[PDB]
Amino acid sequence: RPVLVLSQNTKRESGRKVQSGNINAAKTIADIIRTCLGPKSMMKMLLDPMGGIVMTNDGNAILREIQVQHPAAKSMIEISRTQDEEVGDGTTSVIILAGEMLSVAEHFLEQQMHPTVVISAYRKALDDMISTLKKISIPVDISDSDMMLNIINSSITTKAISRWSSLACNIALDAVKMVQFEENGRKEIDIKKYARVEKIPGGIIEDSCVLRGVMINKDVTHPRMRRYIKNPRIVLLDSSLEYKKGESQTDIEITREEDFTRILQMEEEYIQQLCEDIIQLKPDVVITEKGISDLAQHYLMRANITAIRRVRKTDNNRIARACGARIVSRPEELREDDVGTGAGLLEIKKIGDEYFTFITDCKDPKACTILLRGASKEILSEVERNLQDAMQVCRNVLLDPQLVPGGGASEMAVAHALTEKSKAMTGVEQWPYRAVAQALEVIPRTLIQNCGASTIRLLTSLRAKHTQENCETWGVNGETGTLVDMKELGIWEPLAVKLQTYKTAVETAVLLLRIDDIVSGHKKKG
Amino acid sequence: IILAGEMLSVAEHFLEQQMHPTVVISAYRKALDDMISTLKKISIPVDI
Amino acid sequence: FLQQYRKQRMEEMRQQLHFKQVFEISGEGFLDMIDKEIVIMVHIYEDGTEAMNGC
Amino acid sequence: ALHVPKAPGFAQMLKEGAKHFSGLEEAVYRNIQACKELAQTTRTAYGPNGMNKMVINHLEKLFVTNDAATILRELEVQHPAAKMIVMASHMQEQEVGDGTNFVLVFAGALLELAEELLRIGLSVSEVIEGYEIACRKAHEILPNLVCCSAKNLRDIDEVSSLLRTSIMSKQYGNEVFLAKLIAQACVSIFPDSGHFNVDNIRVCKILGSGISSSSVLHGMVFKKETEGDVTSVKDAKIAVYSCPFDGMITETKGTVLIKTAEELMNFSKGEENLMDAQVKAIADTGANVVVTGGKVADMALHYANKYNIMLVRLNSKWDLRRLCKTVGATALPRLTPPVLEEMGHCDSVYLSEVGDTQVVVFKHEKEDGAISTIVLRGSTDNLMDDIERAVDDGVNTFKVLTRDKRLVPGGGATEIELAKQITSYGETCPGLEQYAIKKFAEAFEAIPRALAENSGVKANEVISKLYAVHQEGNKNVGLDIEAEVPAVKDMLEAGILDTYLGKYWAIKLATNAAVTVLRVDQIIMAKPAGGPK
Amino acid sequence: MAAVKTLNPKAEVARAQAALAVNISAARGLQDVLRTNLGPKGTMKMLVSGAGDIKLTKDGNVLLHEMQIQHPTASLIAKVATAQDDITGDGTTSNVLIIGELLKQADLYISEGLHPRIITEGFEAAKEKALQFLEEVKVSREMDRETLIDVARTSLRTKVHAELADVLTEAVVDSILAIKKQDEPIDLFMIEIMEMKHKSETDTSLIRGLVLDHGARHPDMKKRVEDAYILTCNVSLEYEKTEVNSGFFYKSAEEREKLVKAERKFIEDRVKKIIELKRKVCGDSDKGFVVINQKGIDPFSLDALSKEGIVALRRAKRRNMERLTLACGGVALNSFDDLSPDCLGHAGLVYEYTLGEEKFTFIEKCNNPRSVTLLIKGPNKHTLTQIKDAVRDGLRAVKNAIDDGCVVPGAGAVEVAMAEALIKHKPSVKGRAQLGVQAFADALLIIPKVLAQNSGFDLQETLVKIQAEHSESGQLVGVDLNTGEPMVAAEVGVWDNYCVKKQLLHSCTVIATNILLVDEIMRAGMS
């Protein structure tokens, strides 16, 4: 092992090879999901290494299950994840755009242009892209339920749930509206925590609905408890209702005969005292995140109280939001306002071969459960993903009331605006600017390719149409492959989604263009 | 081939019933001679 | 019915909520992975192995 | 053009080690062949002239016997159809206690004839329907074939005569003596109440003096010694304690807290005095034998020796319960002296040696009691095990006789009559089921054929003579074992009788097993993998 | 090769027609395996596990689970069939057959250059029309005993032997009618299914009470009680350890004896409460007292109870608490703080049955039990499993027939009529989706084809005879498995569950549409 300045496993490559490899890896990542964009997309079957099957056409779902070695592909996958987490839509679009910009950048890199010039041109182009998108946007009236439903339909028409589009749109809109919250002058939506999606295989998807409350896979602890209460008063708890040890070591020393029975009797009396403290509020349902003793169950049933134990913390928080209750740890400190009044029906009913607890008649609930009933587990998972996309789109348009034409209209309009802007640059960086501007045409091109129409003729017609004055809303009909105005077709997208997609694609191109050397093989050196 | 298989199949029945193979063989030979006789009996001539 | 591990299913669909890979060890790699630097599980196989690898 | 690829579809989706057999010749014929092979392996051990088989299991344990159920249990049968037939045989053994070889032979013959029927052109459904109809006809006919009834079960001679036939297949050389032993043991058991318990008969095996020295004891024998110095009692007053013969301790945690010197000095003396008082209170009730299920304290043993009390320790709770049943005592949970109704009584308890084994005997003088023990002697452990299996067969036969007293002639008569009657019935039945009915009738010939083959004579002559004799109308005529030439004799006069319930259940189970095997069309076997247990 | 293989060299990819061919081949293989299952004339299959356990069954779900398959499309179809079994409990084999025939008919047109999207659109339109026709064709009736018996027979004959099916039909119908409460959902948890392995398979019957797989552990307790009071309790009667690490301290043997005698006072108090209640309710010896406890009972308490002529059972099942409460009519108790005679159940006969090592307790002759038990009996283990599966299918069928006031004629008549209606409706569909509608109709036509094939008759000739008879008469005529001639299913009594048909249509159409639209199968999670 003579000399070996660096380690023997340290491999270094640099030059044009690194740039070409990074751009080719990004292009391959784009090509993986190129066919999954548009209303006429085809689904893909992904085999989970743990043995499961993921059957979907979402870009993020497909890319997340793919393991790659080239770090540029890792960057692209992280880009997909970022786009999914930020806005929740446009995941395939950002990947395709990043690939196209990286290709048109490779075009200039083959010549004697330094990457910094390309990066500066890309940044100027991105600023103009943002400006044009803001200019060509239109406002939306959030009070109009029909137009909100239309927006959600335009969002979900490219997914498998598009068949039951009206049902999906109604479910998503209702869930987003009721989970919306306002407290202490702070507005929030929080679809991640509340608006839980519970999927039960079987039944028909036409029976799916969003409940005015929370549904959990729990049963009563004792059969004698009621499984149907009209207007329950629900009390939520964290601490167990059973005799537990203390924190400190508490060894006892029994000498007299009656101390053992006295200790057991005091255990029973402590359980009874806790149960009496609970009963003092006169509730009907008691929910606990931890166990409930059998003696506690007896003392609660003596007061005609239904008790459910071992409930997850997230489910308990969701129930508290739905029925307007507060979780209390110490029963002796329970007070009147902590009792949850507002639930209009509680019912433990059997679905299939399992017991499910329904609290499904709350008045003004701040949490909900979407009950999905479908053919199988994978189909229900895909439906859940589509409905998550719908809820994300609804939240985005609620936070940002701006709206942008879809179906390729926005990309072509922005490209044309940037082209006439670059017409008066008179510099060396005008060429990358124009190239990255025209790279936006990959979205209408992909739509036409997936539809099956003639790519060249349709793109030429669209480009000619966009040269006119009032033609910023002209795109491609992804189902028929014909030019059509989107103020008639009705396809629209939130401005936030387009802005995030454009920004993420341009910054991915910049980040991958900044790199010209790769070294690997060294250990972590923690 | 089919005939030999069937004959051995039906001979196994008697072999499993404490019958020595020589008796089976003698019966087979008598049967073969009578088959030859019967086949020659039911034959018909042909004008070549 | 407690013996059948009712919590198995809930752990199943709460485990999937994260994907990286296990390190593939080089004769001296085994020596110097444990010689330096906690509980460590090491898998021995030659290419049921895939199932436990996914586990 | 050098390889045949797997056909698209299920043939390619099969696992690496799995197997799939489908169709008639690939599954049904193979299953029939396997069942016929199993029946062939077990055939030679049928009847009084059956031959014992040395079977060595995977644990290098040697079994020599002619009991079909034991042989099947000790074999590592792997074929699923043969496994099913073995399950049927074991079920017959559990339900009745005898006829396992009959079940196996009948199932094998039925499956062979079913294969023949399928080959000549019949369908599986038609064969199954014909077999079911013929089984119903046989079960209808069987009550008419009953020759005599037990008519008494408290008599030693009648019970011995009835049980001789059951234990004539096993230990054919000397069955009268074993019949007398089992008859005495069973008559001691089975009180005025009609319920008979099989577990009340105990078997003790002691090497050395040959089976001719075996005897029946009205009581129990335990192969161990006594803890105390007293080794014999003549008016025993057994007091059984389930708790250890020691001062009971706390259940949570016991700590002797000493705070002064006087307590330290007096603790041991007080403990010894207290346990002395306990033992003296136990002895003052007239008790002189103490049986415990737990350990024996050294000081407790000392104080029991001081008061002349016999100590017997029984580790297994089953032995304690059986001793309580056979003496009349109640297993006390504490060291309290026994009340008058809880005090067991035995005629004589003593320590004795048989061969080179030290045993403790709980002996009664009355010819009654709840539990009786048979002491088995022999020159080999395997021989005593086989004799014990024969004793179990005899006891099960006695239990069956208590359940149902009807008897049918043995020695080949019953199934020959059944075959003749079913053949006559089938000839009057039009349709394709007549072939299956006739084959079901012919399958009964496998029993007299097996008996004749094991006896060393020509089976065909015996079967022809049996058909002739039954054609005159002598339905109680079977083959004569003690003859160098094929001959028949009356079975009612010879006392060669087998229980009606045994034949009924054996026929039912064999027919069920054969039909269930026939119903199978496809086999999807998984990879064997491991799983030694 | 493909783009994915460049990034992950050791990845398996099937693109374009390759993925469709793979999926269709898997579906065709599954359908070919499960063709022989359909109908009462289907053939039993033997399944052997790795350990060597033998299972005989005709159920589609059981066969799918026991098949040795590692295919993705097979996994998807197995999940669909599993959901079918979970919700409705029937139609798994029909599910697989319809999925396979849908895929085959779709491929018949796809191989001619047609895009699968048009086929899926035709599938959706035909599914809507078929659902409308199914709503139009269902027979709404009052679910009396005869109709329920017919439905149970129709299921069990396809599941087991005809005579065993006839016995199990009466068993299941009587059980369901026993537990049924007016205008309330049927709780299938209240029908205990117990397996005993000593009698014949036709000896299985229904007990208007409960059977427990354990008996009294004290040998001196009574083996049979004629008139019994039932005490269903959830109170531990064994020794309990103090939660706070108590420990005992003493200075002499007498103190140790006193502590030992005083350490069992807590449990003895509850035992005395039970004994006092027993003395109060039945001061004489005619009546009896039976105690069923979900928790254990130590030998001291067992002996104390047996001294008073009380039979006690420990470590009972949790569901048995509710089962005893609904059957015997008592009140389950979690504590003996205040126990009164009104909390005691009743039972007209309690006795213990011994089967080898196993002990069984029978609680029969109840007044009006809302919970009953089915005692599965047989000579083998595979027989018990087969009878249990058949009983589950029959219970599901009867419950579905009760829930849905309507019932659908069987023998494939409904599907022949649905195919004819789809053919008639086909011209009303614009575009090339008419090919999808035709494929859908041909796919639903599989069930009469498979029934005729299993019965041995010619497939196409029987199908055209059925179709001609249906067109001429307009009735709901299905395949007669004995002669092959058309037969009116309603007149004979071959009934099918309406919910089963609806779920079949929905699930099969959804899964076929999803599979047809898949154009790539990937496995790139390694490295």
Ligand SMILES: Nc1ncnc2c1ncn2[C@@H]1O[C@H](COP(=O)(O)OP(=O)(O)O)[C@@H](O)[C@H]1O
């Ligand atoms: N009916 C339609 N006609 C034409 N284009 C459409 C239609 N519906 C959606 N699109 C376009 O398809 C794109 C959505 O593709 P999609 O598959 O949702 O990718 P992603 O999931 O990454 O958003 C949007 O840009 C939209 O303009």
Ligand SMILES: Nc1ncnc2c1ncn2[C@@H]1O[C@H](COP(=O)(O)OP(=O)(O)O)[C@@H](O)[C@H]1O
């Ligand atoms: N002395 C005898 N003479 C003729 N046959 C006998 C005699 N003793 C027993 N058998 C026959 O032997 C058969 C019993 O065979 P056995 O070996 O006991 O098989 P299994 O144990 O399965 O019943 C009975 O059917 C009976 O007819």
Ligand SMILES: Nc1ncnc2c1ncn2[C@@H]1O[C@H](COP(=O)(O)OP(=O)(O)O)[C@@H](O)[C@H]1O
């Ligand atoms: N006696 C009968 N005559 C004709 N057809 C029948 C009869 N019994 C059942 N069927 C038909 O057989 C089908 C039941 O097949 P089955 O094996 O139960 O499949 P699955 O288990 O998937 O429901 C039903 O659609 C019914 O129409």
Ligand SMILES: [Mg+2]
């Ligand atoms: Mg999208």
Ligand SMILES: [Mg+2]
């Ligand atoms: Mg015998």
Ligand SMILES: [Mg+2]
């Ligand atoms: Mg069915």
